[PDB]
Amino acid sequence: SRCTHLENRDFVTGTQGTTRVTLVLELGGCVTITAEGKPSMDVWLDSIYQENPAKTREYCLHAKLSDTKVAARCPTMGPATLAEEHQSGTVCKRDQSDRGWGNHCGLFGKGSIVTCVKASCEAKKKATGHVYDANKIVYTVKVEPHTGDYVAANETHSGRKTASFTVSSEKTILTMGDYGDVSLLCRVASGVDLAQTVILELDKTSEHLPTAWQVHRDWFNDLALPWKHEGAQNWNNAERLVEFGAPHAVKMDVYNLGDHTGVLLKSLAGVPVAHIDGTKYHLKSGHVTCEVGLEKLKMKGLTYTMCDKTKFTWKRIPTDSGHDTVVMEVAFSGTKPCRIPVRAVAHGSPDVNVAMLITPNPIIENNGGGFIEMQLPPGDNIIYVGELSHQWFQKG
Amino acid sequence: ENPAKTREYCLHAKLSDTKVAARCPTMGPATLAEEHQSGTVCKRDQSDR
Ligand SMILES: *[C@@H]1O[C@H](CO)[C@@H](O)[C@H](O)[C@H]1NC(C)=O
């Protein structure tokens, strides 16, 4: 059961007469679905991603400044000028400088001065944005039958099934092996706000940073840096990384305002990360809405022999899961497929079985089946698996 | 001469290509592709099963 691997979980319960359950599935959540006379199911939103989402605006984090050129004129001669002022990839400022005799100039007054600095971006100091397309984004929903098999989070359940929901994907049927069929219809517009969302990406090779951040579209367009679109040759607003020092005769002081990477990372502290599996850009938060069809699921092995009540041992003793459920695993020593004789008793009242199983009709197979999950009332209880027993105290 | 037609009516229908689909008491609604198609008449009902 995948939803034991997570400390966020939900439990959904249908009666014997149920069909088409409606869910919100969230990234890093998981839902266990239960219905009377049906096998229970773990259903989760595995991922939301796109292959190669469209590059939007690039920003420059650190300017590389060069070719500072100055021209200046005496107070009568009007504007000083440079061809730079008209070239691509330059920053310029025009100002008034005090002039006089000995400033190698005819008259005491203010002379026009112009300075221009050539201003490319520093190597690998780009913050690129990407935008999702509702016509190419994939939601992934995963399902597993809630069998008596325990498999770790670094391991895969053989009954695990996967459905991709693109916009071109209609109501999809997954054959849960011997457990029948489940059907899913997840509406890709009944999910994340893809217009409001940018995947912000820096250097992918940065060993001590996130691969990307999930950032708001308006905030990204409000980043106060030089910027350009994909394939554009030169930075808009290159001024934002250059300061000019107050004019001195025939000088105005070009200052590179330094690397703004740490300014960005402070404004990205605690912000949701996004993973980048090569070409796949993954959200790590967000959700989808689905209808799940239970109406073609089957109970496995309801016609199997009850197991020999003597032949059980624990593999894993009754344990609190943190979800108010108790989990355990048993071995069985007959060479058989059989129904596990599981029950639990409120201590001192042996007649009323109080085991609400989460694994319905628990069964041991020729390989697999020993794991059981159940819910119990507060106070002292005894769990039984035939002749095995374990006194269990239930909190709250 | 040849006054403008209004509505045609049919006095005698012709029925062909009848199809039935049924589903057991909790497997949800039975369906046919013919419930979408033009020129079909359909009924949806409950059967004691
Ligand atoms: C999962 O991790 C455990 C502990 O390191 C290891 O024994 C087991 O083989 C791993 N399973 C897989 C399939 O990687």
In short, whether A222's Cβ falls inside 6 Å of ligand 1 is no
Resolution limit, Å: 3.0
A389, A382 Cβ separation under 8 angstroms? yes
Amino acid at B14: K
Q: In b/e form, how buried is each residue of A204-241, taking b as 16+ CB within 10 angstroms?
A: eeeeeebbbbbbebeebeebebbbbeeeeeebeebbbb
Which residue of A lies nearest to B30 if distances are taken between CA atoms?
A: A295
3-state secondary structure of A363: strand
| Residues present in chain A in total | 396
* Whole-number Cα distances in Å, A158 to A134, A150, A368: 31, 11, 11
**Helix H or strand E encompassing A264:** helix A261-267
CA distance A74 to A334: 106
Contacts of A331 (CB under 8 A, 6+ apart): A312, A313, A314, A315, A370
* Whole-number Cα distances in Å, A63 to A77, A117, A203, B18, B24: 34, 11, 16, 76, 71
User: Beta A10-14 vs A31-35: how paired, if at all?
Assistant: parallel
CA distance A339 to A305: 6
Residue A200, burial from CB neighbour count under 10 angstroms (0-12, 13-18, 19+): buried
In short, whether A155's Cβ falls inside 6 Å of ligand 1 is yes
Lookup result for tokens 């579209």 = A217
Backbone phi and psi for residue A368, each to the nearest 5 degrees, phi listed first = 90, 175
CA distance B16 to B12: 13
Residue A67: both structure tokens together: 């070719």
Minimum-distance ligand 1 atom for the alpha carbon of A156: 13
In short, whether A152's Cβ falls inside 6 Å of ligand 1 is yes
How many Cα neighbours within 13 Å face the side chain of A272? 14
Chain A interface includes B2 (CB < 8 A): no
Residue with CA at minimum distance from ligand 1 atom 1: A154
Lookup result for tokens 């400088």 = A97
CA distance A258 to A158: 54
Amino acid at A167: V
Would you call B27 and A293 a contact, using CB atoms and an 8 Å cutoff? no
CA distance A101 to A123: 45
Residue with CA at minimum distance from ligand 1 atom 5: A154
Q: What torsion, rounded to 10 degrees, do the Cα atoms A132, A136, A137, A143 define?
A: 180
